[PDB]
Amino acid sequence: RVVLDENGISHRSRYFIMLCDNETAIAHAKKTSIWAVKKDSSKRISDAYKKASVYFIFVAQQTYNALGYAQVVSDLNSTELPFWSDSSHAGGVRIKWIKTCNLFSAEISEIVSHMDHGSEARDGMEMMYDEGSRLCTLINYAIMK
Numbered sequence: 226r227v228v229l230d231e232n233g234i235s236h237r238s239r240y241f242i243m244l245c246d247n248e249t250a251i252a253h254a255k256k257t258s259i260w261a262v263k264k265d266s267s268k269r270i271s272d273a274y275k276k277a278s279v280y281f282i283f284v285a286q287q288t289y290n291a292l293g294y295a296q297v298v299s300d301l302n303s304t305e306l307p308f309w310s311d312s313s314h315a316g317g318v319r320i321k322w323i324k325t326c327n328l329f330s331a332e333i334s335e336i337v338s339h340m341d342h343g344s345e346a347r348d349g350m351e352m353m354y355d356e357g358s359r360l361c362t363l364i365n366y367a368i369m370k
Contacts, residue, residue: 233353239277240357241270242340244348246286250309254283258295258320259307266349267315271301273351274318281320282360284346285327289334291364293325323361326368333363 227235243260245251254260260281262270273279274297283292299319306317336356340346352360 227354229354233355234351235277235354235357237277238280238354238357239273240280240282240352240354240360241266241273242337242346242348242350242352243281243283244286244346245283245292247309250307251283251285251292253307253309254320255293255322255325257307258322259305259317260295260297260320261306261310261314261317262301263313263349264315265313266351267301269351270297270318270349274300280323280357280361282352282357282364284333284337286348288329289337290329291326291333291360291367293322294361294364295320295322324364324368326364328367330363330367333360333367336360336363 229235279297282294297318298321301316303316337346340352
């Protein structure tokens with residue numbers, strides 16, 4: 226159906242988690258459709274942009290609240306960083322919001338708790354295709370209730 230690589234990652238659709246820890250960054254992302262990418266995870270995300278459709282799934286760090294998801298629609302850019310970015314960031318990306326929300330789902334939370342091969346998710350991790358598609362479905366289902 227969807228053909229995966231040896232990592233359980235899709236060739237076409239690739240999903241990274243963004244663990245957000247202040248309301249001011251996420252609110253600004255939601256108005257201006259920009260996000261900043263950590264140097265830590267920047268090489269892998271930038272290479273994913275060049276080969277596949279890339280998606281960021283936004284979750285609150287303290288609570289694991291679903292904040293939404295978006296498609297990344299521009300490559301890494303050091304000049305176009307949002308105001309909240311410190312030196313932990315490589316550059317900005319333009320995004321295209323698909324869903325925005327602010328809510329807690331236990332199913333969503335469970336996936337985020339186990340995302341790092343059974344451990345809690347690390348900011349800017351790539352996840353498996355199955356986790357990505359499941360999280361996007363759960364957000365949609367949660368919003369429509």
